[PDB]
């Protein structure tokens, strides 16, 4: 969406490519096309992703478990 | 994003009509509710306190443009406004902000690398005072109307040519002294810095004179108090006259006792000094202020070489000349009915000074008067269709934004903009770069001004184009904020 | 842009109204008229033909649905539920672009695949009394009480297996439903030939006719 | 509320003018007119505009009937008279608003009208004589301008003006007269429009009644008839007795509007006749009046002398078409124009241009007293009247001065409707006419007006942009009368 | 007043132009109409929605009437004209605001249309006449994608005979044609394949009592509107006379004495087609009687009752300009489409006789002509060139709406189409209307009649100049 291309179409192409190929295909933000994302040097950090996986879940379940907001 | 575009468009439209020599005047009411008439875009915009943050961005970009070019702010406003208003309909088509950003960047790079291909430059050098004065008519025609340019160019250039030492030129030394009186034709040029005093006990031929700038300017018991006041005043004046002080400057008043004490040591009583003088004196003759009258010390004391009163303009004014650089400071003496039209004259003088300084940094000149604008527009819009991809629309829009400026100049001249722009664009294919718009004729006729000598600068135009493009790109990127 | 949202809301409202009718265990609604007389029913066809719908396009949906599925037996409420769910699912993708033509192509491809699947899943067990019992029970327990349906299944299945001898499905005239108002609703059977509504003023004329000749001729 | 009712009447008149102002001129814009039932109405000329306009205010209504009665006299300039009247009304109302009593206004307006109408008679043109050739051609081409057909346009102008001058009548009054329906268009095939030449008389494309016609017969008595010579089963079969009797009377070329006879070829070569079908009634009357004859309801019961005659008949094939050249009859009314091309449909532009050239040439041929067009007359009166007022002396100085200034509203409207800048063009016209009287050497500069085709100053006496003197005189008189009538109301 | 009136007209124009801009193409969206009573109708046709919608602005009413009258003139393209006019007015927005008079705009538009005609006549690929293969290709291009997908053969054969039974060699070589003299018989009953073509008109009416002769080897049909005329007909003794008066039994025997077979209760809708098929002349005035009273009619007649109703069979006419196209089937829900398709096919045959060409479809022709004008504008000068480029740019509206009502992004597809099209010299690449992908039209087999394209462009330009010529609308409310 930010790159300007069609939202669902790009993901459809990416998933179609990744289905057949074990390579972690990525998105190229200049043509809206699937890309290997390894040789292009688009690497992102790892510890950030690992911490994000916990930090999203904790807040998600906390907000989802709330009930009956009160005017304290 | 459309609100930001609307705000920038309105701001550009406010000052668009002031473009060129045919700018409408403006009724300027300052914060303190004072009448003011002018046509300069920078003066009104610096007075315009706009509220939309996009307007803030575009105005501060214009301010940065004025910082190192000294003029063309009206041009950058018109150009950026055109760029944004075209980007408005390009966004309305359904395009993305990013892709028009890359298109604009490519167009800007193309314009920068095609600009130096219009070589109508300075003839031989900053010398030949008459020739360069004829060259400096551009900004003079720009701010002040063409009626007075013949004298304004000579007054502005004769002063800046006084000190062409080693190819280094500076602006701060160039100052203008306010002298009301007879008509504009009576204005002239002088060397040094001019301001007036009060007393007549003045000595002309003075050697190195130490300038004393003041930070703070000017029945038995009754007789005792009067005698004490007399003793205190005598002590103050003898403290002033210490270390062989010969000249003293002050923004205060005069007194019979004060002038008697001043003439006791044969010292002139420079009084009614301008409020702007206290630190310009320090920066021009290495002076400093005194907390009171008792502590003038030689270490914290000024030094001027020539201190004599000049009767030029039928007014008593003291001028400082033959300084350490022996030619650095060079004032301009003015004459007019009132300060209202004086302001435009001195602003035109400043614009001429800045354009001459740009010439010092660049002896390369380009044709003006809508010539280079339409030339660059033609080159870019011809290159546009040769570039496949989505940046092509941004390229044509950048070209149209270039097209906007001559249209604004035309409609300010009072002629039909569409007809003259069509004629000029059509002729530019074979009636090449040197062609352009003609001001005098009421019919929309074109005229080649290579002979006319009205040629705007190169480096200033380059920086103006670059900075206006960057401003439009930056303001296009922001999406929204709650307001 | 927003007309689609309006149609979606109307279809979802119609679906939600018709949710609690599908299945034999589903509850039943009741219809009230301006006169005061009320009708108690659960079948979708009569519900859509009798409901007073507010939203216009919801009325469109009801009218077109009844018109099309009058041809087949029933499945009206199931059809309405499926179309409402289709619209909702399509909306969850439309809300982020996804021009409706692509969703239409996906729908048509899924329809083709489902048609082939149904073709290859259908079970062609040979007809007998037991299968007709089962079909009658399944089609009757979704419109009336449990034991009433169980009683009526035998009558309807016997009538239908009687009809089946022609080797061609015919209906309307050949099966007639008579209506009367005896207190014992448990009495429900089938009568061959014809049953006439009433007779004339005759004191014990023939009664047990046995063999008879029919000429009528008004 | 309500004050200075004359101001409200003047505002109503100004509104009526502004409704019609932009529509003046051939390049004027169209208007949309809507009634209660929503009918459509598209037009340029203001006569029908005021005919169908729904006016409500009484003072505006007065201008409406003044324009209407202007229409019934000359049928042109109603827009000009309305605009002139509105400008005079607003100027006079202003003059009242600086406290000049309206009686002096009315006296000055009457005096200025008399002075201007006297000035017209002393500065008109009578060049529409036999010696006016190039002016007629270029006027016809200006009427035909903005057309590609102008490559051979000069030849078309020459032939059309020659045909219209040859076909000219000589009535009882003596003034030249021309029948518009006498000449008509006629398509042709083969060679293109560059070879479309003149036809000396009316020619009908039909079957060859008699090819053995002499090139120039001694006498060709045209006998137009409606009864067909067809065999049936004073005669039972009208085939022989009628034609024999009409030939014995003296008629030579007997024309039957209906079909031909089977054996009529033998009869028509020994009697100099021919049966030509598809004769247009609008053209049958024209040829009857050209020969001098009349249509016969029936031949039964005149024909010896009532039936007209011609001095030659040509039967030849021209541009792949055989034509019945019944030309040079007793009265020169029989004429036609050949249109070379492919069909009538794509030649609509050239036939329309020929029609407009015919109309303008017929308008300028009559009313020999003529005036220059393109606003030249208005500039000339504006030069005359200002000086005349300044030399008049009495209290009516400002009345005549504002009259002179108001006579220059028509050039402004023409310049606006031509997309050119109004002020520049009117200033150029006035400056050009300045030396037309200030310097007697520039005496021929009086005929300087607007060139509507481009919007430039140019002589129109040479250009032929012409208007009848009577039309403009009555226009000015009607405008002045309307102005007086309105200003005399309070 | 001033610019505001023109702005109002052209805004009202743009609104009804873009109200249905999505409704064309093979993937047209379906519009939603509701009257203020709850009645609901779902519509996919531009003419129907424009008819049912109610608007009050005179400009909108005028353009709706323009579309309606263009509908009968050519048939197809009834919405492309509205879209083109609206887009041209929307681009003229920007020139009306910068204070240029409408006159120069009209001049530029007329020059642009003059270039339009020549450019269309240039790029149009030629097509022959009556050859089966590309004729059926045309049928697939235009007639299909509708409810006659499984019954295209009947429409094909009906069109093939129709384009040959209305030939008019009046003033040239068969270039004249009509669509109203075809004796079409839309009678429900039987399978749809029962339709057939019969040479010569046929009449739904016949003699009440068939105790009499109708068919003669030389039918000399005579049109006519007291026995005086009956025994004055003996002037030539035509075998059959068609009139509009009742005949009694004694009157029928009087006809037999007169060697004529008159008819009764027959409308003009049959009489005019009878006259066209037989080529006779009507005369009743005693003085008008001559040798030209009777013109020979058809060449044969037949008595036959089809579908338990009495018909008159005028077969093997002298002039095959008014023949019969019989049509039998279930109902009329399929045959109105057949009627419009045969009208389109007759127009195609007529224009192929006029200009045997087929411009590429799918916006390929639009791209070609836009490229031609945008390259020609570079040479010519004058301030008038801005509208000249604007009309060409706004003519791109057809491909953009085609891509829009397909799912694909218009901007990228349009840029790819144009950028490819400029470098291409004579390719005429277009866009697939079903998948929204670039494809050469000669490969995809889609083409458009030349006459309808010329009519659409000329009508759009004329409507633009008409709506920009108007300077005021005030004549009351
Ligand atoms: N005599 C002239 N004829 C045509 N254009 C002129 C003339 N003098 C100056 N100009 C134009 O005016 C422009 C600058 O004017 P203006 O915007 O008022 O001030 P600034 O120099 O601050 O931009 C220059 O680009 C120049 O081309
Ligand atoms: N080609 C032309 N060039 C300049 N002026 C013209 C031209 N044709 C006509 N006119 C002017 O138009 C005036 C008549 O216009 P108008 O009043 O609109 O006609 P009408 O009265 O029939 O509506 C004339 O006075 C004439 O001067
Ligand atoms: N299958 C298709 N593929 C590509 N283009 C098509 C297709 N069908 C129609 N078109 C285009 O759509 C345009 C409009 O035709 P259509 O929508 O059928 O009728 P109308 O013009 O009356 O709306 C035509 O010019 C044609 O080129």
Short mmCIF file of C-alpha atoms in Angstrom, two decimals, chain B residues 2 21 107 136 139 190 192 241 269 386-387:
data_model
loop_
_atom_site.label_atom_id
_atom_site.label_comp_id
_atom_site.label_asym_id
_atom_site.label_seq_id
_atom_site.Cartn_x
_atom_site.Cartn_y
_atom_site.Cartn_z
CA UNK B 2 -5.19 19.06 -0.36
CA UNK B 21 8.96 45.47 -12.75
CA UNK B 107 13.27 16.80 -13.58
CA UNK B 136 23.30 45.60 -12.88
CA UNK B 139 17.36 43.75 -10.11
CA UNK B 190 29.85 58.68 -1.25
CA UNK B 192 32.59 55.72 4.00
CA UNK B 241 38.59 63.97 27.69
CA UNK B 269 29.94 67.18 20.60
CA UNK B 386 11.55 10.21 -24.19
CA UNK B 387 11.51 8.84 -20.62
#
